[PDB]
Design a protein around this ligand. Structure first.
Ligand SMILES: CCCCCCCC/C=C\CCCCCCCC(=O)O[C@@H](COC(=O)CCCCCCCCCCCCCCC)COP(=O)([O-])OCC[N+](C)(C)C
Ligand SMILES: CCCCCCCC/C=C\CCCCCCCC(=O)O[C@@H](COC(=O)CCCCCCCCCCCCCCC)COP(=O)([O-])OCC[N+](C)(C)C
Ligand SMILES: Nc1ncnc2c1ncn2[C@@H]1O[C@H](COP(=O)(O)OP(=O)(O)OP(=O)(O)O)[C@@H](O)[C@H]1O
Ligand SMILES: Nc1ncnc2c1ncn2[C@@H]1O[C@H](COP(=O)(O)OP(=O)(O)OP(=O)(O)O)[C@@H](O)[C@H]1O
Ligand SMILES: Cn1c(=O)c2c(ncn2C)n(C)c1=O
Ligand SMILES: [Ca+2]
Ligand SMILES: [Ca+2]
Ligand SMILES: [Zn+2]
Ligand SMILES: [Zn+2]
Lengths: 546, 241
């Protein structure tokens, strides 16, 4: 019993479909470092996001196809977590240590940046403008507190430095995952689908046309686990598309690959800076800059950098950093996600408002223009509807904002032949614009709140009622007490399937057993038939009592 | 404390009127709707403060001429000479006044910054007056729906599944009034409650085999005696119980 208790965390168990028609149970070893890396909060958050998006967007037919991909991505991330874990050579080692320090404390730098922005704004809360020095006016900090201006200067410098550290850290730990995902997707597309061989991408596909740059670059499979994708594509499509055309498209040399296949040399790489710069692939760097610039978080951080530099140029610009609270706190993100859920419908609704108010201006310029005199003095009238530019601007700026429509601002229509017509005009403008459209605006936000809440509830219920791997309902396992918990924690646990991949990858091919070799060979062929979908061990041997 | 202060000054007793909220049950339910999303509400007012502060920042640097609230020409009263007064004015007047801050601010017609001020007023009207108050109302409405859905779910779960064994009502519904008989005689909650006292009171030497077995398992914090997933009727369905 003591040995089993000691080795319980390291004993992983999974279930596979099997070479035969019977579900088979597989036992293997889980490394301590693998479990330590898996339990990291970042990995936990990534797994939560993956589960949420998979459940919400469905994709049942591709479920396993997504899951395996997730595992691959996650593995790369924790490799980075292993790498960034806690004359020329001296500066290089200082640079790598500094980069690692920035990578480790990125979130702390974000928190410090938010706090520094709050402090800078609180200091700026004491500005005052006066004509006399402390013809145009001057600005100065009017306060009785000492050394406030030097403190503000130091806070500005520290804020910019910390934000720059944020930029460098984010480039250190987040970009390689995006690059790896893009390389993986492009490799799958050009190896199986052949989107560039005997097929072309669509013109509207911006990313499809952008991915054409790294086709012939020597560093194409960089930042990705596989480095022989181009050779496999050549072997797959040379006999049809033409070996020479494939070589030119992928930038390969048949003689070079042949001689390296026979035997390769081991030249010494020069550590010089000039030769290193010469060895930099310009096209690959251009493609990497293009893909990284399309990211949202990187653009947000670049905007934060620009705001910091403008803050050095003019201190008041730092006020913009207050909006980072929306990106900072999670409840901020949720409540503003309600607004962003129906954003297209919202810009929609304001456009419809503009059109209907334009029609009201059209019918107000042709007949009811006399009633638009906003000048009290009789000597100099001020007609706001002499031309439709002023009339439409007046209706847009005054009629929409003023409660009760445009009739309140417009003169009294009593005592005129068009009094009934003007009454209909004002009442219909009040109902159609002030009431209905703003009601739509509020209803969109309320519906978005309900939508997000329903999505979260559906995800929770789906997770709590059905198993992720086999899909069998919780009731059948609930026949036996705590059956569902045992099934979801021991038999078909997600972490066990994740760990089995690494256990296959680390150990040598000659050490794989029959089951391990079978799973590995079917994995290579992108075949997901080993997952026990629709069946499990318990019902396989229900008569035999397992 | 309120009562003692009421003795000190009688008017303090007015505070006790708020006890109606704690007193009547419907009071508690309707205010539970408000308290359901309280963090989201203090949230939303904080975001309001930040966005109005940004509007004051862009109103202190350029559009400060239009903040003269004094009718007399001899003694002007600028409300945006410093950002303390400008921010207080926007917080206290702009938010409360329907239509944004443009109504209180002077007429921008006839100036080079008239279009810029039009954008300023219209965007302050939409972003502050419309969107944020819409969020405030939507949170309360969503909380009402949340509590109602919770009560409905609890009622349905109680009325459809048995609490002890968890078997659905349909299987018992095969026999007429089967679910009622099962939930009133076989797996009644009160019977399980009473059995614990019946075991605690009687002496240990008087316990039978079944009573002694349940008692020992209870003492070891083991809950395997509860018939979860099985019951008498399906145990002897072939034998007709
Ligand atoms: C987005 C909503 C838009 C509609 C808002 C409706 C609110 C107001 C509704 C009604 C008040 C109508 C005006 C007062 C009556 C005047 C009579 C008249 O038009 O005869 C004219 C002749 O005929 C024409 O020139 C064309 C006749 C139709 C004009 C447009 C009517 C729009 C109806 C829309 C249907 C809406 C139904 C109900 C909607 C709730 C006389 O014109 P005049 O004096 O000889 O010349 C004038 C100068 N002019 C040459 C420049 C033209
Ligand atoms: C929460 C919402 C916040 C934003 C509300 C926006 C409403 C209003 C929008 C627009 C009206 C803008 C003002 C009128 C035009 C003036 C030109 C100008 O700025 O040039 C200036 C030079 O340049 C600078 O000093 C910096 C330029 C940018 C200033 C800040 C713009 C904010 C944009 C936000 C993006 C919003 C996009 C749309 C949002 C719906 C000229 O300045 P000056 O006269 O030489 O010196 C003045 C005194 N000073 C030294 C103290 C500075
Ligand atoms: N094959 C499966 N593997 C794991 N969990 C499963 C599987 N199928 C269903 N589940 C669900 O997983 C739930 C348990 O979640 P789990 O223990 O994985 O949470 P977690 O990721 O540790 O949580 P947290 O969000 O706190 O980090 C069960 O309630 C069950 O409904
Ligand atoms: N094991 C169980 N024991 C008792 N009731 C159960 C059980 N499982 C489910 N129920 C549900 O409880 C309901 C009966 O509730 P009950 O008769 O206890 O109401 P009550 O609590 O006496 O009424 P009140 O709330 O007014 O006191 C049944 O409709 C049944 O669906
Ligand atoms: C098959 N395979 C993988 O699936 C893999 C990997 N590194 C990460 N992953 C996910 N390597 C090196 C690999 O050969
Ligand atoms: Ca072997
Ligand atoms: Ca006895
Ligand atoms: Zn399962
Ligand atoms: Zn029962």
């Amino acid at each position: 019993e003591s040995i089993l208790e000691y080795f319980r965390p390291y004993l992983g168990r999974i279930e596979i479909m099997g070479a035969s028609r019977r579900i088979e149970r597989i036992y293997f070893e889980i490394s301590e470092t693998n479990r330590a890396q898996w339990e990291m909060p970042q990995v936990k958050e990534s797994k939560r996001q993956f589960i949420f998006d998979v459940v919400n967007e469905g994709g049942e037919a591709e479920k396993m196809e997504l899951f395996v991909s997730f595992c691959e991505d996650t593995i790369f991330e924790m490799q980075i977590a292993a790498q960034i874990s806690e004359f020329w050579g001296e500066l290089e080692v200082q640079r790598v240590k500094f980069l690692n320090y920035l990578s480790r404390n990125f979130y702390t730098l974000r928190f410090l940046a938010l706090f520094l922005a709050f402090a800078i704004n609180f200091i700026l809360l004491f500005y005052k403008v006066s004509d006399s020095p402390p013809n145009m006016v001057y600005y100065f900090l009017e306060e009785s507190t000492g050394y406030m201006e030097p403190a503000l200067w130091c806070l500005s410098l520290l804020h910019t430095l910390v934000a720059f550290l944020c930029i460098i850290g984010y480039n250190c730990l987040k970009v390689p995952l995006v690059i790896f995902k893009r390389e993986k997707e492009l490799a799958r597309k050009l190896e199986f689908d052949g989107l560039y061989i005997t097929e072309q991408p669509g013109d509207d596909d911006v990313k499809g046309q952008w991915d054409r740059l790294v086709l012939n670059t020597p560093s194409f499979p960089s930042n990705y686990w596989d480095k022989f994708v181009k050779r496999k594509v050549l072997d797959k499509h040379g006999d049809i598309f033409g070996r020479e055309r494939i070589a030119e498209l992928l930038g390969m040399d048949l003689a070079s690959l042949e001689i390296t296949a026979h035997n390769e040399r081991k030249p010494d790489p020069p550590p010089g800076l000039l030769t290193w710069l010469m060895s930099i692939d310009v096209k690959y760097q251009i493609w990497k800059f293009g893909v990284i610039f399309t990211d949202n978080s990187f653009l947000y951080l670049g905007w934060y950098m620009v705001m910091s530099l403008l803050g050095h140029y003019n201190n008041f610009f730092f006020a913009a950093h207050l909006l980072d609270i929306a990106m900072g706190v999670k409840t901020l993100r949720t409540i503003l996600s309600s607004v962003t859920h129906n954003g297209k419908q919202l810009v929609m609704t304001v456009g419809l408002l503009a059109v209907v108010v334009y029609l009201y201006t059209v019918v107000a310029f042709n007949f009811f223009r006399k009633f638009y005199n906003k000048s009290e003095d009789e000597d100099e009238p001020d007609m706001k509807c002499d031309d439709m530019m002023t009339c439409y601007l007046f209706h847009m700026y005054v009629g929409v904002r003023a409660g009760g429509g445009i009739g309140d601002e417009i003169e009294d229509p009593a005592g005129d032949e068009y009094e009934l017509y003007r009454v209909v005009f004002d009442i219909t403008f009040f109902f159609f614009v002030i009431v209905i459209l703003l009601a739509i605006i509020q209803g969109l936000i309320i519906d978005a709140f309900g939508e997000l809440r329903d999505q979260q509830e559906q995800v929770k219920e789906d997770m709590e009622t059905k198993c992720f791997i086999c899909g069998i309902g919780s009731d059948y396992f609930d026949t036996t007490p705590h059956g569902f918990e045992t099934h979801t924690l021991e038999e078909h646990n997600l972490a066990n399937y994740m760990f089995f991949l690494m256990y296959l990858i680390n150990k040598d091919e000659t050490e794989h057993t029959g089951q391990e070799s079978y799973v590995w060979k079917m994995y290579q062929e992108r075949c997901w038939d080993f997952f026990p979908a629709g069946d499990c061990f318990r019902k396989q041997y229900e008569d035999q009592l397992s």
